[PDB]
Amino acid sequence: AALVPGVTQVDNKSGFLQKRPHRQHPGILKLPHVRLPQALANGAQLLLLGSAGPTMENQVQTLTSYLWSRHLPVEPEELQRRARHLEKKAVLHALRKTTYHWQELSYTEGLSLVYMAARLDGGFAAVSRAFHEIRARNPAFQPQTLMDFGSGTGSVTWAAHSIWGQSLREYMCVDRSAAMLVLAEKLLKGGSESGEPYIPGVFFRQFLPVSPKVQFDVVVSAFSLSELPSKADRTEVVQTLWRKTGHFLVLVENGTKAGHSLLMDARDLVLKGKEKSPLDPRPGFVFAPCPHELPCPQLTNLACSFSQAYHPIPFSWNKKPKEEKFSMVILARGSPEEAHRWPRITQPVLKRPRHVHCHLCCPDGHMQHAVLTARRHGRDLYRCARVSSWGDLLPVLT
Template identity: 35%
Template sequence: MEKVTGDHSLGNLMNKGAAFSKYLFSRKAPMEDQSLREKIRELTEIVESNPTKYKLPATLPDPTNEQAVKFYNEMKRNRVETLMHQRVYAWQAIEYDEYKSLLYLFGRAPQEYASILKIFKEIERRDENFAPRTFFDFGSGVGTGTWAASELWSSSLFEYYLVDASKYMNDLSDLILRDGDINKNISLRNVYQRQFLPSRDQKYDIVLSAYSMFEQQNLNERLKVVNNLWNKTENYLIFVENGTNSGFQLLNEIREFLMDLKEQNNEKAFIFSPCPHNSDCPRFTLNDGTPCNFEVRFNSLPFSRPSQIHNHLYSYLVIKKGESNDTTDKWPRIVRPTLVKSKHTICRMCTKEGDLQEVIFTQARHGKQAYRCARHSSWGDQYPAESMESYEKETKTTRIKAQNKLKYGTGNEETPDLGG
């Protein structure tokens, strides 16, 4: 990273990169045309219903006086535009030139690499025999997806196909892979940098879109890209966005679209992570204003002193093509920080039934092993039980058998008939 800064000050890139990162984290998707028209009508009614507050004439002008009507409408339009600026997010596309690409590298690379690597590690852990040959990264940016993929699967990966609309991003990504020296060869095999999605129908073992969907101008454009990426997927399709309400809502749109697409085309696929089900997201249907997100910790870049540990919130979706043959796919997911108390632990989970549950673990009720497991579980982990109801019933049965064996020398669940 130090080698690619050119004439720019490292301190300046660090400071302005951090500010740029905050801006990117606060971004929202552009408002759809229909929603925009509805908002304009709503604000127009607000202005018309309270003319004094918005400094409009208390009475409407004479309709026969064209000049007065025109002046009134102009005033009203100005008031509505002012409210629009105050209440509606003004989305703008970001053009990544050479300098903005460097700001992105120093402001966003550490947390993006950390979140992508964490998702990839879960795939590696749960799918031990998975040895991907091909990797496709849409909106590849400075190459954080490639860094993470090569960290785990460099021995099996034979092709890396990176797509980013910015020529400068592609050049920077390529230079980093060359260790900052344009004359040095890339150590990875077959890395391709492109500005546009390929027209060929080749499929890839891993298809990734990380922090890229906010750059699409509307929902229709986003879903076109999603459909294209779905058709390029052989095994895993992964989406990652900031863990904000906007990022979560955007991913939920993608989630619903892909589940409907799967049903329409009669394809076999399931949500691998984070959801233990294919039903509607309970966090979204609950509509309590909180997103389904997760946390990753990462170290600050070594250029700043002293080194610090930061937290990054992200939302993600992993869909795997094929059938689910592993019971661990249905294990509940802990979707909020675990609350560890003196004699109990509270876990908030999303279950295979498609609902949210809060389970209070105690040693007396759930047994020592389950209790210890809950106390050592973290936000984002799976809890090793197919369902909490069956787990509680199973642990209760186990305890009764153990108690009866101690008292009566039998392992029967019911108290034995002692006669007389």
């Protein structure tokens, strides 16, 4: 409960309410409809000129739905418990049913083309929103080094360029798939096998460097940890990425229960330090979206996700703007900047006559369903909530 009617008031630092309207309150983190850089869209369409017919539309739709509804691989112990329950109540067949068949996706050339056509714009939108979080809240940050695990098509690289190109000088892109690496190189070279890179300093590797000595300013993993075959693999990858994180570790997955569970495991892993004497002793905290380091109040039954609207790459099947629903967690080195941390709106805000419904993740670690009205909460706080939206912050104190 971060909104007590009649007690909580808007947080006015830097002389807010006097010097600037309500629509521009500092928790406004909404990003306008994302449009890809023209070079990237041109390269994608050129690379798909070969085969973009009716079959490709079906393949893209199938791949998108398959990835969206994919579950985490089931760990041994859960299968053991289910097997015991079924036996107490043939068992193997009943386990083939009511259990998800998780399979490795082998990204060959054809499946890489399909994945690019199906997910480039969506991934770019999600990563751009996650990066806008850091840019908006810490505008003095000028990263010089970026690593991106599971760099599929380079959407992370392109978003990082679009935001921090005047400071970034090294883009490490790790991906075990040679086809995916080749496609990323072609996309960076304007869709042609021979050309000059659009972004300078991009390094492509097939193996993840494992060494605490080398440390990047921004480490990213977008829709990548869900490809790993087991929780042990996810754990080791997240540990490596945190060890090599210099300032910010950005994890982005689908906006589903599976993606949110994966990200909450990663968040707990990073927050609970196990290493006895690490080379980098700085502690880690959650920069966004959580205003606390306590266990997620919403991991029990629901999930937590955020939406970013964007314009898809023009195709025979992409006509209208789309929404990208994604789960994010940003872990920052050091300690929280201050103690005036603000609730996060984790659900669409519903505007109704003279009241506003907002679901808040409060700094105390609990969810609050707040119906804000002028008479109860104050005109200024009501106006701030009225202009706020999904994924923003509400500037409230005491």
